[PDB]
Design a protein around this ligand. Structure first.
Ligand SMILES: *[C@@H]1O[C@H](CO)[C@@H](O)[C@H](O)[C@H]1NC(C)=O
Ligand SMILES: *[C@@H]1O[C@H](CO)[C@@H](O)[C@H](O)[C@H]1NC(C)=O
Ligand SMILES: *[C@@H]1O[C@H](CO)[C@@H](O)[C@H](O)[C@H]1NC(C)=O
Lengths: 365, 761
C-alpha cells in the first residue's frame, strides 16, 4: 500500500500504510469459509464511524458474531486464532455487546476498541453507556413526561416573547450581553428538543431485536445520540443558571459589585489578547521542542493544558529536561517567571484599581 | 478534463498556511488604510519658493475666475483649490497664490497653468508667479504674459496643433503609477473616487485568484498530457514551473479587469458595494477551492505550486499592468482626445509615519510566512514520530533495561529480548546491523563494599588507546584482534551521566544471523571481553519505518561508576532522512530564503551604523537587532549542515551496507537542533506581534506600565535572591513572595499613574 525506496527494496519485502478509506483492503484472505474472511460493506453492516484515537474508522470490515454459550464461542475464537486472523495488516479491532439488568430499567451497551498503529504497538479504549429505552413504565416517568411538555411550552413562550422584542419593539440592538445570551439559551433548547424527538422517534432496532433474540442487537446508534444529547442538555443548564445575574440588583451594594465588572470587562479584554498571544507562543515552542519525547506535549491541546496545569503548580518537571537539556529547565524557569510574577499579576492590579475608582465614582455622587 | 479527487482525510499545511497569511495581512492593513484615507477625505477639500503671485498687473475683471497650476515633474503632481477670501478676484481685484503644494519637483522644469472664468473674460493679462528661491527653487523665474480667454491654457517647460505627441506623454506620466494597482496604494492622487480601500481589495483578489488558478492545475488537471505532478521535477524547469504561472495570470484578468469597472466610473450609483461583495465572495470561494484541492498534494508538488504562484505575481508586476497602462494611455490619447490629467507639518509627519508602517508590514508578513513554512511546513510527521518513539520502548522492555543492576545481567538481556527483536520472520525491519563499541579506561577500578549506591559517581582516570589480542593484551603479529577503531571525524559526544565520550572504542559487529550472533556473544562472553575496568558498553543500532517514512537512532548505554553495579540510560531519536541531493525540497527553499532575510537585516544595520557614526553601542536597538541576525543565520546554516550530513552518511552506508554500521545518530541530533532554532525565531516574531498591539488608543497603557515598572521588579527580585543567599550562607522564597503579592501593587501604582496621565488628553 505504500512505496518502497528502490535503494533498500531488496530488504523491505512489503509495507502496510496507515489507515485510510482510500487504502482499505476489500478482498478475501485465508480460508474463505464464513463472514470473518469476506469484506462486508458499511451499508449492509448498519455501522457508522467511531472517531478513535489514531484516526476515524469506518463501519465496514471483517466481522464475526460469537455464539451464545462459552464452550462453542471458545472454539470459534480458537479457530480464529489458529488460521491467523490478526496479521500485520490489521489496524483496528472492535468487540461489542449489551446487557439489560431487569431489576432497574436501564440498558448498558459496551464497546471495546484496540488500535494497531502502523508504527507498531497497541492502543486500547473502552466505552460503557447506560441507555434506557422502555421509559414509560413508572409513574415518575409520567411525571417527567409532563414536566418536559411543560418545558416545551416554556421554550415556545420564551421564543415568541423574544421575537416580539425585535420588530414589534427595539430594532437591531444586541450589544447588551443579556439579549445575546437569551438567544443562545433558546437556540440550544431548540437543538436539544430536536435531538430528543429524533432519538425517541425511531426505536425500531429494539423491536427488531425483540422479534428474534438470537442475533446481535445494534444499539450503537442510540448510545451516540444519548451522549450528544447529554452534552447539550448540560450546557443549557449552565447558561440558564448564569442568566440569574440579570436580576441581582436588589440593593445599593449589589449594584456596584456588578458595575465594577461591567467597567473592567472592557480593559481586561484588551490585556487578555496580549496574554494569550504569549501563552500560545510558549505553547507552540513547547510543542515543537518537547512534543516528541515527553507525551505531556504530544499534541497542541495537551501543550495548552500542561501550561494551565503549570499555573496551578500541579505538574513536576522531573522528565522535561530528559527530552532536552539546553531548553529543558530554561523553558520552565522563564515561563514561571514571566507568566507567574509579571504577567499573571496585571490581571489583579487592573481589577483592584478599577474597583477603587468605581467607589469614588459613587462616593462623590 | 477533470477528476474529483476526494482521496482521504489527509491535510496539507503549506497551502493552508499560505492562504491564511494573505488574508490576515489584508485585514490588518484595512485599518491602516482607513486611518490613512480619513486624512485625505478630511483634507481633500515646500520645495517651491514663495510664489510671487501678487497679481497687481490685471484689472477690468468684473467676474470670478479660478486658476489651476499643475506642479508637474518627476514624482510630483498637484493642482489648485478655492481661494478662500472676500476679494476672490472681483472687479479690478486679485490675490497672491499660496496653497498646500507639498508635491513639488526638483530644480527642473515644472509648469502647467490653466485659468477658467465663470462667465465673462477680463481684459487683462497676469504674467505668472515668478518665484526665485525660498527653500529649494522648485520653479523658474519666468513668465508668458498672455491674455485670458474662455478656458485659457498656458503651458511651458523650465496652438499645439499636434497634441498627440504631448498628450501621450502627459497621460503616461499621470497614469504610470496611478493605474498600476500593485504600487498604487501608496501614490493615489487626491480628489479621486477610488478611495484607497478598494485598492487593497483588488490586490487581494488577484492574490487569491492566482492561488486558486495555480492550485487547479496541480492535483486537479492530471489527465490531459500527464505532464503534471510526478513526471516534472519540482526544481525550476521553466517548462512547467514558470509557464503555469503565466497562463494562470493571463486567464485570471477577465475576472479582474471587469470588476475594476464597478469601482472606477461608479458615481453607477451603488456599484461599489456590489463590487465589494462580489470580491469578498470570490476570494472566499477561491480559498476554499484551493484548500480542498491542495489537501491531496504529494510533498513534492506543493513546493512547485508555491514557485508557480510566486512567478505569477512577477508577471502581474513586470509587464501586465505596464501594458494595461500603455493601452489606457493610448486610448485616452487617440479617442476623445482628453486634454486634462502649524497644523500643516503635523499631518505630513503622520502620513509619513503611516506610509513607513505600511511598507514595514509586508516584510514582516513575508518573514512570518517563511519561518512558518520552515518549521510547520512538515507538521504531519510529528505525531508519527511520537508513536514510533513510544513503540520502540514498550516492545524493547525499557523498564527492564533501565532497572538492571548486575553488570552480568547484560548478557541475558541481549540473549532474551535484543536478538528476537533484531532477527525474526519479518519482525520490524532493521536497516543495518548493531554494534557494541567499548571504552576500556586503562585504569582498572577498585570497588566499594555493597549497600547504598555510593553517592553518584567517582574514582575514574584516563582512557585506553592501544591494541590487544584475543582475551586481552598480547599483540603478537600485527595489530590486536581487538583494535581501537579511532573515533570518526564527525558524529560522537554522547555526554553520559557524569562523563563525556566520543565515537571511538573497541567495536563488535555482532554478526548478521541469529546463530552466528549467539556464537560471537558466547565467544566474547567466555574470553573475558567485559569483566575488566570497562567504563561503558554503548549498544546502539538503528530503526526504519516505511509506513510513515521515518528513521530512528536508538542508543542503549550502561555506565559503571564503580565496579560491581551499573546505571542504564537509553535514547531513541526519531527523525526524517531528507537529503540535500534530493532537489529543491522545502527545507532548502525555506533555508536559502531565510539566509536572504539575514542579509537584508544586516545591511539595514550597516546603513544606520554609518549614518549615526560612532557610539551607537549601549542601546537596545543596536543589540536586539544583531541577535536576530545571529539567530536567522544559525537557523539557516544548521539545516544545510544537516542536509549535507544526510548525503554523506547515506552514501557511505549504501557503499558498504551489508557489513557496516555508519552510525546515523549525528543526523538525529542536527535534525533536532535545526528544529530548536526554527521554533524560537517564530517565538520572537509572535512576541513582536503582541508588542505591536500598542497602536490601539485605550490599550497602549499596558506596554508602558510594564516597561516603567521593570526596574522596581528587578530590584525586588534581586533583594529576595540575595536575602536567600544570605539565609543559606548560615549553612523557598517563591512561596513567600507569591504570598506577599508585591508585584501586583508595584504594577497597580504605575497603572494608576499612567491612567491619570492619559485621562486629561
Ligand atoms: C505482499 O506483497 C509483496 C510485494 O508484492 C510480497 O512480499 C508478497 O506478494 C506479499 N507478501 C505477503 C502477502 O506476505
Ligand atoms: C473451512 O471449513 C470449515 C468451515 O466451513 C472450517 O471449520 C475449517 O477449519 C476450514 N478449513 C480449512 C481452514 O482448511
Ligand atoms: C442490518 O439491518 C437489516 C435490517 O433488517 C438486517 O436485516 C441486517 O441483518 C443487518 N445487518 C447485519 C450485519 O446484521
Amino acid at each position: 500500500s505504500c512505496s518502497i525506496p528502490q535503494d533498500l527494496r531488496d530488504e523491505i519485502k512489503e509495507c502496510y500504510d496507515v489507515y485510510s478509506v482510500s487504502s482499505e483492503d476489500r478482498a478475501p484472505f485465508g480460508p474463505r469459509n464464513g463472514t470473518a474472511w469476506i469484506y462486508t460493506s458499511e451499508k449492509d453492516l448498519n455501522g457508522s464511524s467511531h472517531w478513535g484515537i489514531i484516526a476515524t474508522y469506518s463501519g465496514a470490515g471483517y466481522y464475526l458474531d460469537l455464539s451464545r454459550t462459552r464452550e462453542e464461542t471458545a472454539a470459534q475464537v480458537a479457530s480464529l486464532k489458529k488460521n491467523v486472523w490478526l496479521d500485520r495488516g490489521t489496524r483496528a479491532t472492535f468487540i461489542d455487546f449489551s446487557v439489560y439488568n431487569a431489576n432497574i430499567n436501564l440498558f448498558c451497551v459496551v464497546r471495546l476498541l484496540v488500535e494497531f498503529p502502523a508504527t507498531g504497538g497497541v492502543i486500547p479504549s473502552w466505552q460503557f453507556q447506560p441507555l434506557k429505552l422502555i421509559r414509560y413504565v413508572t409513574t415518575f416517568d409520567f411525571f417527567l413526561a409532563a414536566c418536559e411538555i411543560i418545558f416545551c411550552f416554556f421554550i415556545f413562550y420564551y421564543v415568541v416573547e423574544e421575537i416580539l422584542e425585535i420588530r414589534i419593539h427595539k430594532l437591531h440592538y444586541f450589544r447588551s450581553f443579556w439579549n445575546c445570551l437569551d438567544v443562545v439559551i433558546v437556540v440550544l433548547s431548540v437543538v436539544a428538543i430536536g435531538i430528543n424527538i429524533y432519538r425517541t422517534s425511531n426505536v425500531e432496532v429494539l423491536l427488531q431485536f425483540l422479534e428474534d433474540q438470537n442475533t446481535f442487537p445494534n444499539f450503537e446508534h442510540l448510545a451516540y445520540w444519548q451522549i450528544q444529547f447529554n452534552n447539550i442538555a448540560a450546557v443549557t443548564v449552565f447558561f440558564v443558571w448564569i442568566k440569574l445575574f440579570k436580576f441581582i440588583n436588589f440593593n445599593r451594594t449589589m449594584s456596584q459589585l456588578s458595575t465594577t465588572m461591567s467597567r473592567c470587562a472592557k480593559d481586561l479584554f484588551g490585556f487578555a489578547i496580549m496574554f494569550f498571544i504569549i501563552f500560545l507562543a510558549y505553547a507552540q515552542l513547547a510543542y515543537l521542542v518537547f512534543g516528541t519525547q515527553v507525551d505531556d506535549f504530544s499534541t497542541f491541546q495537551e501543550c495548552i493544558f500542561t501550561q494551565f496545569r503549570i499555573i496551578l503548580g500541579d505538574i513536576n518537571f522531573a522528565e522535561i529536561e530528559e527530552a532536552n537539556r539546553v531548553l529543558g529547565p530554561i523553558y520552565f524557569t522563564t515561563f514561571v517567571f514571566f507568566m507567574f510574577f509579571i504577567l499573571l499579576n496585571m490581571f489583579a492590579a487592573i481589577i483592584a484599581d478599577t474597583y477603587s475608582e468605581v467607589k469614588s465614582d459613587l462616593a462623590q455622587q | 478534463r477533470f477528476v474529483f479527487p476526494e482521496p482521504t482525510a489527509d491535510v496539507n499545511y503549506i497551502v493552508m498556511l499560505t492562504c491564511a497569511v494573505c488574508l490576515v495581512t489584508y485585514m490588518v492593513m484595512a485599518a491602516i488604510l482607513h486611518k490613512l484615507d480619513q486624512l485625505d477625505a478630511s483634507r481633500g477639500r515646500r520645495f517651491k519658493y514663495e510664489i510671487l503671485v501678487k497679481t497687481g498687473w490685471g484689472r477690468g475683471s468684473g467676474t470670478t475666475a479660478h486658476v489651476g497650476i499643475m506642479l508637474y515633474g518627476v514624482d510630483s503632481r498637484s493642482g489648485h483649490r478655492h481661494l478662500d477670501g472676500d476679494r476672490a478676484f472681483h472687479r479690478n481685484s486679485l490675490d497672491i497664490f499660496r496653497i498646500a503644494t507639498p508635491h513639488s519637483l526638483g530644480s527642473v522644469w515644472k509648469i502647467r497653468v490653466w485659468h477658467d472664468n465663470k462667465g465673462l473674460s477680463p481684459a487683462w493679462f497676469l504674467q505668472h508667479v515668478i518665484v526665485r528661491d525660498l527653500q529649494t527653487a522648485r520653479s523658474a523665474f519666468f513668465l508668458v504674459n498672455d491674455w485670458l480667454s474662455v478656458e485659457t491654457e498656458a503651458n511651458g517647460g523650465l496652438a499645439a496643433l499636434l497634441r498627440f505627441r504631448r498628450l501621450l506623454v502627459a497621460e503616461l506620466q499621470r497614469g504610470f503609477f496611478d493605474k498600476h494597482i500593485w504600487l498604487s496604494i501608496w501614490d493615489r492622487p487626491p480628489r479621486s473616487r477610488f478611495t484607497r480601500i478598494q485598492r487593497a481589495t483588488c490586490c487581494v483578489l488577484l492574490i487569491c485568484l492566482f492561488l486558486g488558478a495555480n492550485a487547479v492545475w496541480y492535483g486537479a488537471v492530471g489527465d490531459s498530457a500527464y505532464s503534471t505532478g510526478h513526471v516534472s521535477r519540482l526544481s525550476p524547469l521553466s517548462v512547467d514551473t514558470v509557464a503555469v504561472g503565466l497562463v494562470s495570470s493571463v486567464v485570471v484578468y477577465p475576472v479582474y479587469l471587469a470588476i475594476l469597472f464597478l469601482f472606477r466610473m461608479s458615481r453607477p450609483a451603488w456599484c461599489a458595494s456590489l463590487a465589494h461583495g462580489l470580491s469578498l465572495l470570490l476570494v472566499a470561494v477561491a480559498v476554499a477551492v484551493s484548500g480542498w484541492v491542495g489537501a491531496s498534494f504529494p510533498p513534492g508538488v506543493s513546493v512547485a505550486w508555491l514557485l508557480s504562484s510566486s512567478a505569477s505575481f512577477l508577471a502581474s508586476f513586470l509587464g501586465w499592468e505596464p501594458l494595461k497602462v500603455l493601452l489606457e494611455a493610448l486610448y485616452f490619447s487617440l479617442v476623445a482626445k482628453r486634454l486634462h490629467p502649524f497644523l500643516a507639518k503635523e499631518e505630513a509627519r503622520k502620513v509619513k509615519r503611516l506610509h513607513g508602517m505600511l511598507r514595514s508590514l509586508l516584510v514582516y508578513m513575508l518573514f512570518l510566512l517563511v519561518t512558518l513554512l520552515a518549521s510547520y511546513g512538515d507538521a504531519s510527521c510529528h505525531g508519527h514520530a511520537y508513536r514510533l518513539q513510544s513503540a520502540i520502548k514498550q516492545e524493547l522492555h525499557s523498564r527492564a533495561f533501565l532497572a538492571i543492576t548486575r553488570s552480568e545481567e547484560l548478557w541475558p538481556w541481549m540473549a532474551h529480548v535484543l536478538l528476537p527483536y533484531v532477527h525474526g520472520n519479518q519482525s520490524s525491519p532493521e536497516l543495518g546491523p548493531p554494534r557494541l563499541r567499548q571504552v576500556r579506561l586503562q585504569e582498572a577500578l577498585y570497588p566499594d563494599p555493597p549497600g547504598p549506591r555510593v553517592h553518584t559517581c567517582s574514582a575514574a582516570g584516563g582512557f585506553s588507546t592501544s591494541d590487544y589480542d584475543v582475551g586481552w593484551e598480547s599483540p603478537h603479529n600485527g595489530s590486536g584482534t581487538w583494535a581501537y577503531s579511532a573515533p570518526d571525524l564527525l558524529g560522537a559526544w554522547s555526554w553520559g551521566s557524569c562523563a563525556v565520550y566520543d565515537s571511538g572504542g573497541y567495536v563488535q559487529e555482532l554478526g548478521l544471523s541469529l546463530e552466528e550472533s549467539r556464537d560471537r556473544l558466547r565467544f566474547l562472553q567466555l574470553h573475558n571481553w567485559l569483566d575488566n575496568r570497562s567504563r561503558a558498553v554503548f549498544l546502539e543500532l538503528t530503526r526504519y519505518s516505511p509506513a510513515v517514512g521515518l528513521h530512528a537512532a536508538v542508543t542503549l548505554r550502561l555506565e559503571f561508576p564503580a565496579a560491581g553495579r551499573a546505571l542504564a540510560a537509553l535514547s531513541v531519536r526519531p527523525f526524517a532522512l531528507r537529503r540535500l541531493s534530493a532537489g529543491l525540497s522545502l527545507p532548502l527553499l525555506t533555508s536559502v530564503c531565510l539566509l536572504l532575510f539575514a542579509v537584508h537585516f544586516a545591511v539595514a544595520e550597516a546603513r544606520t551604523w554609518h549614518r549615526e557614526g560612532r557610539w551607537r553601542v549601549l542601546r537596545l536597538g543596536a543589540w536586539a537587532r544583531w541577535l536576530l541576525v545571529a539567530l536567522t543565520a544559525a537557523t539557516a546554516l544548521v539545516r544545510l549542515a544537516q542536509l549535507g550530513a544526510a548525503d554523506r552518511q547515506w552514501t557511505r552506508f549504501v557503499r558498504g551496507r551489508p557489513r557496516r554500521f555508519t552510525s546515523f545518530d549525528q543526523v538525529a541530533q542536527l535534525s533536532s537542533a535545526a528544529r530548536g532554532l526554527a521554533a524560537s525565531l517564530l517565538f520572537l516574531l509572535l512576541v513582536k506581534a503582541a508588542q505591536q498591539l500598542r497602536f490601539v488608543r485605550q490599550w497602549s497603557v499596558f506596554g508602558k506600565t510594564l516597561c516603567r515598572a521593570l526596574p522596581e521588579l528587578l530590584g525586588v527580585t534581586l533583594g529576595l535572591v540575595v536575602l536567600g543567599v544570605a539565609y543559606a550562607q548560615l549553612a523557598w522564597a517563591l512561596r513567600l513572595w507569591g504570598a506577599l503579592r508585591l508585584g501586583a501593587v508595584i504594577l497597580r501604582w504605575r497603572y494608576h499613574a499612567l491612567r491619570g496621565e492619559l485621562y486629561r488628553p
